[PDB]
Design a protein around this ligand. Structure first.
Ligand SMILES: C[n+]1cn([C@@H]2O[C@H](COP(=O)(O)OP(=O)(O)OP(=O)(O)O)[C@@H](O)[C@H]2O)c2nc(N)[nH]c(=O)c21
Length: 186
């Protein structure tokens, strides 16, 4: 007879995820300022990471945190992002204190907990931008043309964050990045 796995195995996550950190430095290419922190694929390992790193609200302006499925780099150029887009959450200066941190954690939980159910395969990850003019959080998806998946993900995400329902958020395609209107709204 063998031991009861319930008493000792870590609680597995559907996907293995990777957390990245971005430190702004004008003298270097965007990609050069983007570096991996570490990866994890269990509930225990997620908290071990989250608990020892600074809350988004404490980072220096210009820095980002990005949680993307293992194998998908948090950039437009990636095979899994080039044809996709993002649901953007735009926060005001007051929300840095009131909602940024709780919104980001809920975002992390939505990702690792596969809260988008049937459309989990369309989800790539999420990014939080700490900025002086106003912080930003966003869920990135793989194909801007998958209306069904994209709209359902947006609705679910918006409901999970729990902000006033009357507030509309938009979805923008990465390819449409101005050298930017929304494709969908919920
Ligand atoms: C997500 N992303 C951001 N950048 C670079 O980062 C710059 C800033 O893009 P940003 O997404 O970090 O928002 P920010 O608020 O800092 O600035 P703004 O929206 O223009 O006011 C871009 O114009 C790019 O030069 C990126 N550059 C490359 N090559 N690939 C990416 O995926 C990528």
């Amino acid at each position: 007879e063998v031991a009861n796995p319930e008493h000792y195995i870590k609680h597995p996550l559907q996907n293995r995820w990777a957390l990245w950190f971005f430190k702004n430095d004008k003298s270097k290419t965007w990609q050069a300022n983007l570096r991996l922190i570490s990866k994890f694929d269990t509930v225990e390992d997620f908290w071990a990471l989250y608990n020892h790193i600074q809350l988004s609200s404490n980072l220096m302006p210009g820095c980002d945190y990005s949680l993307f499925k293992d194998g998908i780099e948090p950039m437009w150029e990636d095979e899994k992002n080039k044809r996709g887009g993002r649901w953007l959450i735009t926060l005001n200066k007051q929300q840095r204190r009131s909602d940024l941190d709780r919104f980001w954690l809920e975002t992390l939980l939505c990702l690792i907990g596969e809260s988008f159910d049937d459309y989990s395969d369309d989800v790539c990850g999420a990014v939080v931008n700490v900025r002086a003019k106003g912080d930003k959080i966003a869920i990135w998806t793989t194909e801007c043309e998958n209306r069904e998946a994209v709209t359902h993900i947006g609705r679910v995400y918006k409901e999970r964050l729990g902000l006033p329902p009357k507030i509309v958020i938009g979805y923008q395609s990465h390819a449409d990045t101005a050298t930017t209107k929304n494709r969908f709204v919920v």
